[PDB]
Amino acid sequence: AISDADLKYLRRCVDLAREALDDGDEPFGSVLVDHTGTTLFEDRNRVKGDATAHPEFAIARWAARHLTPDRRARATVYTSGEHCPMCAAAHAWVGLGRIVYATSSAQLGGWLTEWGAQAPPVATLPINTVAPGVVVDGPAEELAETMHNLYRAKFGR
């Protein structure tokens, strides 16, 4: 179950990943959405400061800065690509709720290997390995090609 509504948000994350790519950054987009449906915060990759400038992390801090603990747990975080261990840990520490992702990090690491790309210094661990009690849906089969192409644009070799 990835709902027709979820898809709407994952597509938006993909738009944001595109946006990041066009500005010279890595293609990752993420979106914070309250239990109501109102979209509270949108972000994308900004590595062109530290290599840690991931949207999913920036949401985690925004979630702590402006929401109450009860709100956070009722929120959902959509993302173009599955949270990396930094981002999943952060999500769990601030006690955010659901995660939905369009491609897995399994998908991504496979494709990097295909392109002979530098295997990242952080392991492509599933979210549930890092944050065991988070509810996780993903990946989305409809967006797999789209993301494969997006990732290729930045990591193909």
Added chain:
Amino acid sequence: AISDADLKYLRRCVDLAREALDDGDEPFGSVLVDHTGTTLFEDRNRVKDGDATAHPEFAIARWAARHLTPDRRARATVYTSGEHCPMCAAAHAWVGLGRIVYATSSAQLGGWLTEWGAQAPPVATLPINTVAPGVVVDGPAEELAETMHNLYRAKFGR
């Protein structure tokens, strides 16, 4: 590979974890040190003020990228009272910092929390090398095990 020199820094991290506790935070201290032996940055836990991600090992990771060069970062070592959590280990690896030395492991911490009937943290107690495979990791320090058991107990046994 806990050298005498390393211990000096781990004791300093413990002092910092104590400073955090006293001020009403969780007892975690960490210290950034260049090859030269000059201590570039010191920090401790700051989660009371509101944010559960306010870990000193992460704050070093960002300080390391804003203020050093990549070659200096790999050159550097990060000491910590308690083994880096997955957030912090990942951050360390992303910014390409070098060695990590830790006084207690997370295996130690989780085993105590269970000993005290404490709630497990929402993030799993993964070794650093599970998250950041190519980081050089020394720790734990037998001399500081009792000290940290008691410190952790003070916050997480009550």
